[PDB]
Paper text:
In contrast to these prevailing themes in inhibitor design, we produced a multiple-target [name]-based inhibitor, [name]-[name], by introducing four mutations, R2T (P4), K5R (P1), F12N, D14N into the cyclic backbone. The design principle behind this variant was to maximise the intramolecular hydrogen bond network while minimising intermolecular sidechain interactions. The entire protease and inhibitor residues at the interaction surface were well defined in the electron density map, with the exception of Asn12−Asn14 of the inhibitor, indicating increased flexibility in this region. The overall structure of the [name]-[name]/trypsin complex is similar to that reported for the [name]-1/trypsin complex, indicated by an RMSD of 0.21 Å over the backbone atoms of the two structures. The hydrogen bonds between [name]-[name] and trypsin are largely confined to the P3-P1’ residues, as summarised in Fig 1B and Table 2. The sidechain of the P1 residue Arg5 extends into the S1 pocket of trypsin and interacts through an extensive hydrogen bond network and a salt bridge. A conserved short antiparallel β-sheet is formed across the inhibitor/protease interface, involving hydrogen-bonding pairs Arg5 N/Ser214 O, Cys3 N/Gly216 O and Cys3 O/Gly216 N. Meanwhile, [name]-[name] restores the original intramolecular hydrogen bond network seen in the wildtype [name]-1, adopting an identical β-sheet motif. The surface area of [name]-[name] buried in the complex interface is 690.7 Å2, accounting for 47.7% of its total solvent accessible surface area, as analysed using the PISA server. Compared to wildtype [name]-1, the sidechains of Thr2, Asn12 and Asn14 are folded inwards, reducing the intermolecular interactions at these positions. Overall, the comparison of crystal structures between [name]-[name]/trypsin and [name]-1/trypsin shows that intramolecular hydrogen bonds are maintained in [name]-[name] to preserve an extended β-sheet structure with trypsin, while the interactions outside this β-sheet structure are largely minimised.
[name]-1 is a cyclic, 14 amino acid peptide (GRCTKSIPPICFPD) stabilised by a dense intramolecular hydrogen bond network and a bisecting disulfide bond. It is also one of the smallest natural inhibitors to conform to the Laskowski mechanism and is a potent inhibitor of trypsin (Ki = 0.1 nM). Kazal domains are “standard mechanism” (Laskowski) inhibitors which mimic ideal protease substrates, presenting an exposed loop (known as the canonical loop) to a target protease. Consequently, an equilibrium between cleavage and religation of the scissile bond occurs, resulting in the formation of a stable inhibitor/protease complex.
Residue numbers in the entry:
A (entry chain I): 1 to 14
B (entry chain A): 16 to 34, 37 to 67, 69 to 125, 127 to 130, 132 to 183, 184A, 184 to 187, 188A, ...
C-alpha cells in the first residue's frame, strides 16, 4: 500500500 | 501537502516545480545550475520552473529552464527506493534573486525532534485529491530512527528518515515528491514515499540528503 509521492504515484502491493 | 498552510509567494525561493506539461514533482535549487530531486521523479523532457507561486498563472518572477542533464543515483533501487535522489543540471543558469535562491547542503545530519519546513504543490487531501494552485508549507519534526523503523518494519534504509506526525493529519503527499525538507537552513530531506498521506502511524519517509553531500559535490564537479 506504500506509494511514492509523485504524480502519478508508484505503488507497492503493501 | 496535507494539513499545511499557504507559504506566501516566493517565501521558499529554493523550491522548484518539475513540469512535463503538468506539475509532477518538486525539487530544490542548490546552485544557479543544479537542482536536487527524487530518483523516482526521473523522466525525459523535464522543464524546471523556478520562482513559482501559483503554478497555473504566469504572475511574474518565473523562470522556465529545460533540464539538460537528469542524473539518477547509479544505485537507485526502484523497489526499495534506496538512494532515491536525482541531480538535474539546468540548460542555462538560473538568474538568482530574492525570489530564486539556492538552499545550502548540510554539513552534518540532523537530529530527531528538529523542526523542518516541507513544501510543495502536492495533494492537500488525505482522502481523495485536491491539488493547490499556490505553494503549500508544513512544519514537521524529524522522528527517531526506532520510531521510523517501527512504523515501516524492514523498509527504512540508512539513506532514509521519517518526519511528521504519528497522530495523522499533517504530511506530504502525491505531487510533493522530490521537494525539500529544510531544517535549520539546510536541505536534509527529499520527499520520497509513505503509506497513504497523513495517516495515523504512517509518517512521511524522506531521502537522507546528508549521506549524499559528497556524491552531489563529486557529480556536479565532473559534469
Ligand atoms: Ca506562476
Amino acid at each position: 500500500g506504500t506509494c511514492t509521492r509523485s504524480i502519478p504515484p508508484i505503488c507497492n502491493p503493501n | 501537502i496535507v494539513g499545511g498552510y499557504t507559504c506566501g509567494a516566493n517565501t521558499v525561493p529554493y523550491q522548484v516545480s518539475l513540469n512535463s506539461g503538468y506539475h509532477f514533482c518538486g525539487g530544490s535549487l542548490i546552485n544557479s545550475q543544479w537542482v536536487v530531486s527524487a530518483a523516482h521523479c526521473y523522466k525525459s523532457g523535464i522543464q524546471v520552473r523556478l520562482g513559482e507561486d501559483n503554478i497555473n498563472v504566469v504572475e511574474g518572477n518565473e523562470q522556465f529552464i529545460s533540464a539538460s542533464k537528469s542524473i539518477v543515483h547509479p544505485s537507485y533501487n526502484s523497489n526499495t527506493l534506496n538512494n532515491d535522489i536525482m541531480l538535474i543540471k539546468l540548460k542555462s543558469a538560473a538568474s538568482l534573486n530574492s525570489r530564486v535562491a539556492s538552499i545550502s547542503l548540510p554539513t552534518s545530519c540532523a537530529s530527531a525532534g528538529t523542526q523542518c519546513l516541507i513544501s510543495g504543490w502536492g495533494n492537500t487531501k488525505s482522502s481523495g485529491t485536491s491539488y493547490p494552485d499556490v505553494l503549500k508549507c508544513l512544519k514537521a519534526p524529524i522522528l527517531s530512527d526506532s520510531s521510523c523503523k517501527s512504523a515501516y518494519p524492514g523498509q527504512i534504509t540508512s539513506n532514509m528518515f521519517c518526519a511528521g506526525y504519528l497522530e495523522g493529519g499533517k504530511d506530504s503527499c502525491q505531487g510533493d515528491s522530490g521537494g525539500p525538507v529544510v531544517c535549520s537552513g539546510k536541505l536534509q530531506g527529499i520527499v520520497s514515499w509513505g503509506s497513504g498521506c497523513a495517516q495515523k502511524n504512517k509518517p512521511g519517509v524522506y531521502t537522507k540528503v546528508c549521506n549524499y553531500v559528497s556524491w552531489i559535490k563529486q557529480t556536479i564537479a565532473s559534469n
